[PDB]
Amino acid sequence: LQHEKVTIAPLVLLSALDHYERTQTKENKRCVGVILGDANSSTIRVTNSFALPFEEDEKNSDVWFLDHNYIENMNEMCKKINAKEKLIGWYHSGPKLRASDLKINELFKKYTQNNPLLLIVDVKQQGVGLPTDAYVAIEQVDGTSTEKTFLHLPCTIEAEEAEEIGVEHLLRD
Amino acid sequence: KETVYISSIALLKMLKHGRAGVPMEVMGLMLGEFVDDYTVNVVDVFAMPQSAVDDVFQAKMMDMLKQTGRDQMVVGWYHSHPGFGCWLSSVDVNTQKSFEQLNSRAVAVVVDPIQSVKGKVVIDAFRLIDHYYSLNIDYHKTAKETKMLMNLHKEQWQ
């Protein structure tokens, strides 16, 4: 029941970057989408993704809008292609956690079989390690009450065999 | 003289779809632009369900991608040959004829996801003569994609 680590396919990171670039996201703006894969074991496998329409107010972090209908309509098309890649959470371009992220995460709790994963993908990556930070929501305990917070989980990259050759092929031009 | 440029996510999605569909031939649509007389730019692809192309599925996917900043037109189709190389069968030629009637520049890409695991991607791009011929394929990589992929490879295998 406890997730302990996350693996991510290279395609997911490239898809997040393509989403960021094709929507001309700049400045402090972020793009947001869904991640797919398998979260029924202690290692969450993140193997696909898709972009969401998403707007949020520049200053008021309390004003944001995510199209429920888009989530459902697109996930159903993904189901028709590969039913094994379940909706397991969401991603955004960060580069860091934002004040609205716990409330947005509550929206995705209605779509996931397990506790949702948030993947922050730093698409403006300079050179220091994996451009990802993975989080799940937990209750954190003063020891008189608890509050919801995010727990960082370690990530590694895991590529399917043909996708790994794809990456090497791209790198070799 | 003509080149088909394939984006990073287009290549990986075609390999992924083809691998997941083994032992079946799976197919999808290629999105992009006919930028001039000598260049087809494939910026993205999407899978079609196994089945005669489902026009309702295609239209819906196109509508939703436009809503998230992907408004490129269909420039052709891809499908997988799991283990037996890149070429067009008679059924493939008929399918390509349908695409060429809609746009004379449409391209048929064939990927072999099984032979690809031996170390080099096995992929080709075809158009009909009026039986068929191969188009040169090249890959488009942005500086950001190159840096991302180089860093991921170094992190994974050091």
Ligand SMILES: [Zn+2]
């Ligand atoms: Zn075929």
